């Protein structure tokens, strides 16, 4: 297993910021050999945008992931299927995601769609939950890529995201290969949310 702790800042309408503390861990599914990486950082830049042609609730994502501080499956563009099932304070909803993943430049292009109507939480609060095996590792660090070395069997991603002064998401994710497309199947349970706090009140400015 490996661990990462980070805090995402979300801008609010009233100028203030909403903080999202992340506890993340990853566990290989396969019973085989994996790499135990030293401390290293993942530097993520990430932009969100809209398809103007899409009438459904959606989020376009462009992301560049790069490390600083059993892999051949990624030598090129891998397809991605993402499926999230969540309920937040009893709100049942699903997000479906398609796109490509090029590990060679640490770039992800994915478009996500709310399958069940209106998304009951702001899309930014679901970004860090909605495939870090695509992050580009330099060659002096090619040995510290846990994610790739757990493939195609995959790994389990488990993360609790608590929003200060508000509720918390608890997600479970299976990130594996499924017939030469990479899949992220995720459950998400949010509890104890203020029914008109930043999240359920939809008070987050939309970018990140």
């Amino acid at each position: 297993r490996i661990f990462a702790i980070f805090t995402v800042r979300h801008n609010v309408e009233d100028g203030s910021v909403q903080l999202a503390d992340h506890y993340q861990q990853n566990t290989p599914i396969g019973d085989g050999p994996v790499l135990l990486p030293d401390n290293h950082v993942l530097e993520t830049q990430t932009v969100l945008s809209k398809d103007p042609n899409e009438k459904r609730d959606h989020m376009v994502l462009l992301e560049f992931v790069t490390a600083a501080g059993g892999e051949e499956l990624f030598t090129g563009v891998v397809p991605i299927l993402v499926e999230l099932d969540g309920d937040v304070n009893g709100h049942k909803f699903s997000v479906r995601g398609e796109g490509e993943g090029d590990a060679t430049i640490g770039k992800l292009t994915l478009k996500f769609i709310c399958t069940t109507g209106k998304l009951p939480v702001p899309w930014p609060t679901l970004v860090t939950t909605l495939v870090q095996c695509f992050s580009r590792y330099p060659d002096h660090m090619k040995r510290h890529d846990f994610f790739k070395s757990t493939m195609p069997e995959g790994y389990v991603q488990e993360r609790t995201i608590s929003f200060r002064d508000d509720g918390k998401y608890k997600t479970r994710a299976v990130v594996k290969f499924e017939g030469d497309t990479l899949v992220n199947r995720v459950e998400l349970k949010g509890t104890d949310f203020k029914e008109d706090g930043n999240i359920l009140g939809h008070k987050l400015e939309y970018n990140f």
Binding site: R1, I2, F3, P37, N39, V41, L42, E43, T44
Partner: peptide, 9 residues
């Protein structure tokens, strides 16, 4: 922009 520190069990 964000950087993320990954540990080890």
């Amino acid at each position: 922009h964000q950087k993320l520190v990954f540990f080890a069990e």
